Design a binder for this molecule. Structure first.
Ligand SMILES: COc1ccc([C@@H](Cc2nnn[nH]2)NC(=O)c2ncnc3[nH]ccc23)cc1
Length: 164
């Protein structure tokens, strides 16, 4: 049910939208979370997704961490999407602000290829320190499944589209 997306490639689409409001409107099979290895959903996409689930995402995440330990940088896990989606694919992109290797961003995007269609943010951008133009390039060059990108900042959306 995605609408108002601009087509970038055969499988990559983009919209200036809040991923939480997109998830509520569409109820996608998969919503991607921009997670950290601990699944501590404090801010950004994670804090926003968590708050929309009334903290049910954090409770579920803490139980997952208690059982399995932390995720790898570039890794992922599939948990419930609660009221936003059937599933939430928690993906850990490298945090450039913590000295994490930017090459792990390709590995993080590879997790998207296990799902036919996903609603997602740009990985490693925002508070994770990577260049969003670089993140979009890696997305297009790595993801083969149908990905619908929600870009929150209008000025960033315009820059991403005009430079692609
Ligand atoms: C920690 O990794 C991050 C990854 C991406 C991000 C940024 C990248 C970005 N910056 N301007 N639009 N996009 N995205 C969001 O914060 C974002 N995107 C879509 N819908 C949203 N609703 C609430 C937040 C939000 C930050 C952090």
């Amino acid at each position: 049910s995605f609408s108002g997306y601009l087509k970038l490639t055969d499988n990559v689409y983009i919209k200036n939208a809040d991923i939480v409001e997109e998830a509520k409107k569409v109820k996608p099979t998969v919503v991607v979370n921009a997670a950290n290895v601990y699944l501590k959903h404090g801010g950004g996409v994670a804090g926003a997704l968590n708050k929309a689930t009334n903290n049910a995402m954090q409770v579920e995440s803490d139980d997952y961490i208690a059982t399995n330990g932390p995720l790898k940088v570039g890794g992922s896990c599939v948990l419930s999407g609660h009221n936003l989606a059937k599933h939430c694919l928690h993906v850990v992109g490298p945090n450039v602000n913590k000295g994490e290797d930017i090459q792990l961003l390709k590995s993080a995007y590879e997790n998207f290829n296990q799902h036919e269609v996903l609603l997602a943010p740009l990985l490693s951008a925002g508070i994770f320190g990577a260049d969003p133009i670089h993140s979009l390039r890696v997305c297009v060059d790595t993801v083969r499944t149908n990905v619908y990108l929600a870009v929150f900042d209008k000025n960033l959306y315009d820059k991403l589209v005009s430079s692609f």
